[PDB]
């Protein structure tokens, strides 16, 4: 049910789209959230996904952290997708603005390999401070499952396609 995606490789597809609107339309099995270790969904992709669930994602995440403690940078957990998807794979890419190791980006993308098909953003991009061109390269060289990337910014989308 994904449509209008540009094929980059055998298993990586990309589209200039708002990931919230794309999730509401497609209702995929898995939507990836650009999470932090605390599952505090304040801004960026995480804030936008949580707002679309009417804060139900935050309530569920706070119960998860109270039981399990924080995730690792490069780690993930599977929670409900609420009204946006069957499941949400919360994945923690390194946040370069908070001083985290960029080599953990490959570990973060490895979490996608546990799911046959996913709707996802580029990890560690945007407010996480990493170079999105680097993030797309690690994605294509690490994920073997079918990933549909939603890039919110039109100008960044055009730069990613032109330089791929
Ligand atoms: O989409 C991405 O590639 C990641 C990131 N997106 C958001 O922060 C983001 C924020 N608010 C949102 N409301 C609905 C979707 C949505 C996404 C981003 C990165 C670089 C630039 Br320039 C712009 C946006």
Curated annotation (Swiss-Prot):
It is found in: Host endoplasmic reticulum membrane. It catalyses: Thiol-dependent hydrolysis of ester, thioester, amide, peptide and isopeptide bonds formed by the C-terminal Gly of ubiquitin (a 76-residue protein attached to proteins as an intracellular targeting signal). Changing residue 29 to A: In strain: Mu/B.1.621. Inhibited in vitro by GRL-0617. Signal peptide: none annotated. It comes from Severe acute respiratory syndrome coronavirus 2. It is a multi-pass membrane protein. It comes from the Viruses. Residues 1-164 form the Macro domain. Changing residue 162 to L: In strain: Gamma/P.1. Responsible for the cleavages located at the N-terminus of the replicase polyprotein. Participates together with nsp4 in the assembly of virally-induced cytoplasmic double-membrane vesicles necessary for viral replication. Antagonizes innate immune induction of type I interferon by blocking the phosphorylation, dimerization and subsequent nuclear translocation of host IRF3. Also prevents host NF-kappa-B signaling. In addition, PL-PRO possesses a deubiquitinating/deISGylating activity and processes both 'Lys-48'- and 'Lys-63'-linked polyubiquitin chains from cellular substrates. May form homohexamers. Interacts with N protein. This is Papain-like protease nsp3.
